Design a protein around this ligand. Structure first.
Ligand SMILES: Cc1cccc(C)c1NC(=O)Cn1nc(Cc2ccccc2)c2ccccc2c1=O
Ligand SMILES: Cc1cccc(C)c1NC(=O)Cn1nc(Cc2ccccc2)c2ccccc2c1=O
Ligand SMILES: Cc1cccc(C)c1NC(=O)Cn1nc(Cc2ccccc2)c2ccccc2c1=O
Ligand SMILES: Cc1cccc(C)c1NC(=O)Cn1nc(Cc2ccccc2)c2ccccc2c1=O
Ligand SMILES: Cc1cccc(C)c1NC(=O)Cn1nc(Cc2ccccc2)c2ccccc2c1=O
Lengths: 79, 79, 79, 79, 79, 85, 85, 85, 85, 85
């Protein structure tokens, strides 16, 4: 037997009100807020990569080796 | 046996009100907010990549190796 | 036996009100909001890629290796 | 037997109100806020990588070796 | 038997109100706030990497050797 | 006098505003005004006797949520001789 | 007098504003005004006797949440002779 | 007099503002005004007797949350002869 | 007189502001105004007798949270002859 | 007179401000104004007798949290003849 990332809840009663709940979060992006007010941005690009926005990436994988969740704003010239 | 990312809930009663609930979240992007007010953006691009918007990516995979969830704003010139 | 990303809920009673619920979320994008007010955008592009909008991608796959969920705003010139 | 990252809760009563709950968070990005007001940004790029935005990456993997969660703003010229 | 990162809670009563809860956090980034007001940034880049934004990365892995959670703003020219 | 000009350009934007007043805006926000959440009551053997003569009585398990803009919110009001001239 | 100019450019933006007043804005925020959360009561054998004559009485398990803008929020008010001229 | 100019450039921005007044803004924030959270009461054998004549009485398990802007928030008010001229 | 200029550049920004007044802003902050949290009461055998004549009485387990801007917050007020001219 | 200039540059920023007044800002901060936290009371056999005539009485387990801006916060006020001219 093997348990990994398991949320367990048990409750027992005879008379009254009983509440049982279980929650699980794996690879979750929650609550991203961005505000830009009266912002000046001047970009001159020649063959490059420029990133100025908002990026939110959430990845969950099982039995995955070598995976990349995010790769933002890069120049790759492998030979 | 093997349990991975399992949410379990059990409840028992005789008289009254009983509530049982279970929730699971895997690779979930939740709550992304962006505001731009009176923002000036001037972009000149010659053969490059420029990203200024909002990107939200959520990926869930099983038995997947080498997967890329997001690749935003890049220049690739592999030989 | 093998359990992965399983939400389980069980309830038992004799008299009264009983509520049982189970929810599962895998590769889900939820709640993306964007506002642009009085925003000036000037873009000059010559052979490149420019992205300024809103992108929301959700991907769920099983037994998929090398999959890419999102690839936004890139220049590819592989040889 | 083996337990890893397991949240367990148990409750028992006879009469009254009983509440049982369990929560689990693995690889979760929560609560990212950014504000830019009256900000001036001038960028000149020639074959490089410039990143000025907001990046939020959350990755959860099982049996994954060599995985990279985030790789932002880099130049790679491997031979 | 082996327990690692396990949150356990148990409660027992006869009459009254009983509350049982368990929480677990592994590889979680919480509460990142950044404010830039009237900030001037001038960047000239020629073949390099410049990073000025906000980066929040959270990674949780099991049986993963050699994994890199974040690699921001670097130049790699391995031979 | 407010003047905005743009001459001899390739892409030009010229905006002029005399007076401007911004407003209220919500983006991905949650609000709760006058909200009752999660009330649980258990009673086994309760004896209640009420003798009310010309008054307001509130008895039992009561869960009241009120949201008022230009009025009054009351639960029990035993008044008299209310006049507006 | 407010003047903004931009001449002999490739990309030019010229904005002029006389008077500006910003507003209220919420981005990914949560608010709670007058919220009752998580009330649990257990009673076994309670005896209650109420004799009310011309008054306001609040009895029992009471959970009240009120949110008022331009009015008064009251639970029990036994008044008299309320006039507005 | 407020003047902003930009001449002989490739990318040029010129903004001029006479008077500016910023506003209130919330980004990823939580607020709690008048919030009652986590009230638990256990009673076994309680005897209550109330004899009210022309007054306001609050009895029992009471959980009140109030949020008022331009008014008064009261729980028990036994007044009289309220007039506005 | 406020003047801002930028001439003979490749990337140029020129902003001029006469008068500026910043505002209030919250970023990733939490606020608690008038909050009651975590109240637990246990009573076994309590005897209560109340005889109220023309007054305000608050009895029992009471949890009150109030947040007022331009008004008064009271729990028990037994007044009389309230007038505004 | 406030003048800012930038001439013969590659990247140039010129900002001029006559009068500036900063505001209040919170970044990752927590505030608690009028907060009651963690009140536990245990009573076994308590006898209470109250005889109130034209007054304000507060009795029992009381947990009150108040936050007021432009008003008064009172718990028990037995006054009379309140007038404003
Ligand atoms: C709630 C309650 C119960 C029992 C005793 C009382 C005093 C109250 N309070 C109020 O009625 C508050 N009020 N008063 C007035 C003015 C008015 C009232 C009665 C007769 C003539 C004029 C009013 C007018 C227009 C729209 C709303 C309202 C309002 O809401
Ligand atoms: C809540 C309550 C219960 C019992 C006893 C009292 C005194 C109160 N308090 C109030 O009624 C407060 N109030 N007063 C007025 C003015 C007014 C009241 C009555 C008659 C004529 C004029 C009012 C007018 C318009 C909209 C709201 C309101 C308001 O809310
Ligand atoms: C809550 C309560 C219970 C019992 C006894 C009292 C004194 C109070 N307090 C108040 O009514 C406070 N108040 N007063 C006034 C003015 C006014 C009141 C009554 C009659 C005529 C005018 C008012 C007007 C408009 C909107 C709100 C309000 C308000 O809220
Ligand atoms: C809470 C309470 C209970 C019992 C006894 C008292 C004195 C109080 N206190 C107050 O009513 C405070 N107050 N007063 C006034 C002015 C006013 C009051 C009554 C009649 C005519 C005018 C008022 C006007 C407009 C909006 C709010 C308010 C307010 O809040
Ligand atoms: C809380 C309380 C209980 C019982 C006895 C008293 C004296 C108090 N204190 C106050 O009412 C304080 N107060 N006074 C006034 C002025 C005023 C009051 C009554 C009648 C006419 C005018 C007021 C006006 C507008 C908004 C708020 C308020 C306020 O809050």
């Amino acid at each position: 037997k093997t348990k990994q990332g398991v949320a367990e809840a048990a409750g027992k009663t005879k008379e009254g009100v009983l509440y049982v709940g279980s929650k699980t979060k794996e690879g979750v992006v929650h609550g991203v807020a961005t505000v830009a007010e009266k912002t000046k941005e001047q970009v001159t690009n020649v063959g490059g990569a420029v990133v100025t926005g908002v990026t939110a990436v959430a990845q969950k994988t099982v039995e995955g080796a070598g995976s990349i969740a995010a790769a933002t704003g890069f120049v790759k010239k492998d030979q």
